[PDB]
C-alpha cells in the first residue's frame, strides 16, 4: 500500500530480449485508495427461450435446470432482445426448470428472454517483486508472461 496521490507508471516488458521496437511504458495512473478488500463484479446473463404464449403471459424453458432455481429467482426482472420487460411469476411443477412469466406486451416465439445478473469477482493475490540486481545479467528479469 501507498499514500493516496502517489503517481506510478506501468511496463509490461523489462528484459532486453523482448524489448523490440515499441514503446515500453504501458500504463500511467494515480493511486486513489488503499483497502484490504474490494467488490468487483461481472455481468452474468442467463438465457432462456419461450415455448408457450398467452398474450402477456408466457412459459419459458432452458433458463433454469430445475424448479430449484426458479424459486430463488421468482419475481426477477427479465426482458427480451426486443426490449419487452417481463417477470418470473411462478415455477411450473412439470417439467423441471420451466416457469411462467408475464410480459409488458405479447412476445414472439423467436424472441429470447434474458435475465441480467451480476456475479462477484475476486482480485488475485500475486506479488512478484523485481530483483534485477540479484541476477547475473541484471537485464533479463522475467516473470509471469502475457496471455498472447
Amino acid at each position: 500500500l501507498c499514500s493516496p496521490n502517489t503517481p506510478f507508471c506501468g511496463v509490461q516488458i523489462v528484459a532486453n530480449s523482448d524489448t523490440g521496437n515499441g514503446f515500453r511504458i504501458a500504463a500511467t495512473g494515480i493511486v486513489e485508495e488503499i483497502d484490504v478488500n474490494i467488490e468487483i463484479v461481472k455481468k452474468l446473463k442467463l438465457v432462456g427461450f419461450p415455448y408457450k404464449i398467452f398474450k402477456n403471459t408466457a412459459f419459458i424453458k432452458d433458463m433454469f435446470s430445475s424448479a430449484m432455481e426458479v424459486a430463488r429467482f421468482e419475481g426477477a426482472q427479465i426482458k427480451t432482445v426486443s426490449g419487452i420487460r417481463g417477470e418470473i411469476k411462478r415455477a411450473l411443477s412439470k417439467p423441471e426448470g420451466h416457469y411462467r412469466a408475464a410480459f409488458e406486451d405479447k412476445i414472439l416465439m423467436s424472441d429470447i428472454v434474458i435475465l441480467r445478473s451480476w456475479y462477484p469477482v475476486r482480485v488475485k493475490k500475486f506479488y512478484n517483486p523485481v530483483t534485477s540486481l540479484l541476477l547475473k545479467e541484471k537485464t533479463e528479469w522475467k516473470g509471469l508472461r502475457l496471455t498472447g
Binding site: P129, V130, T131, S132, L133, L134, K138
Partner: protein, 49 residues
C-alpha cells in the same frame, strides 16, 4: 561504496549460500533518517531490510 563484513570463517564452514552482513556508505538525502536502529528501508532490486 559497498562492503561485506561477513567473517570468512562463516563463509567456509556453512558455505557461500549463507546470508551475509553488508555495509553501505553514502550521503543521506531528503528527510532526516532516524538514528535508532531497526528502521525499515527498501533497496531497489534487492528487497526491504
Amino acid at each position: 561504496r559497498f562492503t561485506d563484513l561477513t567473517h570468512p570463517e562463516l563463509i567456509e564452514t556453512q558455505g557461500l549460500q549463507i546470508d551475509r552482513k553488508v555495509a553501505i556508505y553514502g550521503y543521506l538525502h531528503g528527510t532526516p533518517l532516524p538514528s535508532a536502529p531497526g528502521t525499515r528501508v527498501h533497496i531497489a532490486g534487492v528487497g526491504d531490510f
